[PDB]
Design a protein around this ligand. Sequence first.
Ligand code: 6GY
Lengths: 304, 299
Amino acid sequence: EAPNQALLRILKETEFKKIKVLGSGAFGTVYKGLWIPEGEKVKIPVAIKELREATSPKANKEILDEAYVMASVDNPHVCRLLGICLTSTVQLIMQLMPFGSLLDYVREHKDNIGSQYLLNWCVQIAKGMNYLEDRRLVHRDLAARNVLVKTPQHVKITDFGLAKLLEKEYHAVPIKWMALESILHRIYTHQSDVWSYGVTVWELMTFGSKPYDGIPASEISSILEKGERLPQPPICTIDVYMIMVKCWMIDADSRPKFRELIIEFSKMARDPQRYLVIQGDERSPTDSNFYRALMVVDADEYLI
Amino acid sequence: EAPNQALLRILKETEFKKIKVLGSGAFGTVYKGLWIPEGEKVKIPVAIKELREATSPKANKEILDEAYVMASVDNPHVCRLLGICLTSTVQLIMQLMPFGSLLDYVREHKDNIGSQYLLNWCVQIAKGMNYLEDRRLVHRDLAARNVLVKTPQHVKITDFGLAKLLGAEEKEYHAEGGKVPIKWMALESILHRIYTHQSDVWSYGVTVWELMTFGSKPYDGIPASEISSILEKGERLPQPPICTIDVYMIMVKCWMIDADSRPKFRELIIEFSKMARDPQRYLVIQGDERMDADEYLIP
Ligand SMILES: COc1cc(N2CCC(N3CCN(C)CC3)CC2)ccc1Nc1ncc(Cl)c(Nc2ccccc2P(C)(C)=O)n1
């Protein structure tokens, strides 16, 4: 092949600080963290994955393979891996963006978010996944909360808990955001990621409304077998919304492939106003509220 | 062009039940039913279509594309669908045309169909098909069996399982293979699998002769294979007895070999709307002097 001239930074546990916990699991747990590196004035937002136990050689094998893949990931729309840290409990530092996640952004800015932006993010999210899918990497948790805002023009999808097919499947919870075949079998393919990519665009178009809200997670299995999907967002034409219906096809192969979505979504992004209808579309970028919590330096800016 | 703000509603199959099979088909089965929107306290009678097997991705893509057209058309003479059900095998929920195909309607009632309705029914098909010509669409299976009767006064068009859309660039569409009823199709479609609206004027043509004879079998004894031969040779369908030569000439100008020689639907609307201003004059039928909610829920 080619040399994987990928770089692996070793940070010291006294450089990063765990602020609060994000997710948790049997083995492993994910925190919100601030990185203060090598005596600079800058503080960079990050998320840190910690093996819950420090002596488990099968678990320690796993957490390094993931470090391996996250460090091999070099794409503008998948988060970089800032560095690992060899405590007893091995830690991974993925970067975060200073402005926060899309969902919190889209919710806070829906009276000045435009049509060219919404369609421009669908290509960035789809570009990022087809990068991942290009690598036999399944993502298993795509959602607006896991798409971070670098600049209202650039978004990356966080890549913790990726699943390489080292083949037609790999097993492994976010019920609203999952394919039926995931709820009933806890199996994740790339086409189940397409389902997630579906629900992700829905959260975007609705300006951050909650998928299947109030409804219990035990029903979603059933109210999917029976054919209820998310409704049409108001601003969606029937061209946009057919993409979303196709992502939630019960048949997995009937679902759009990721290479297709970007073709389809940039074509619709060259005439943006023809596919999305937003009141006042014609007549602004700024800071967020996740960003207000921190007061604040992008990690892509420091390491340059 | 214009943003297509046509929405499609998604319905879970708990919101409708099927009461009666209206017909088995190669498409599959279509049922008669009541659809009670959850939330709403109306029942709306509906017709529910359900293909044989959702095994192929091609089968799914051709049912969701059939649903894309039906959902975005707002024409009075184009049967519209209410919503879709994304079950394992998807499901289509359309307004129930209570009276059947026109093909069924005019055999049962050959004894009580005056000239006014038959020419009114031809102005209505032509208006729906000129809506479809305006949306760059080719229906590709028009026939009295695919024209449904919501009321004797008002007829609508249906079954876009074979409908195909044109780009702005190409003026004609060409499929391969397929299974299409040979007796309703223009000669170029039989012979080159070419299609275009001018091939659908020919279909419209056969649809009238269907109506004008009160629902006969076109080329009845003739099997499908010979029709290419017989058309090339200049055989066409005979004159309906009810028909004047003014009216039967129009069906002739449809089965014209040259597709642009054939008449545009825009013309067909005017030519038949005049004819319905003096209907006794262009059609001759002995006796002719003598003879829950709905799509009211849409607005
Ligand atoms: C209840 O109203 C109907 C009655 C019948 N009848 C007509 C007489 C027929 N006869 C009666 C006498 N009997 C002894 C032998 C049979 C039985 C079926 C058929 C159809 C509708 N309405 C209806 N609405 C919407 C649709 Cl969308 C649809 N579609 C549809 C219905 C049936 C078959 C195919 C279709 P398609 C072309 C694929 O939509 N169909």
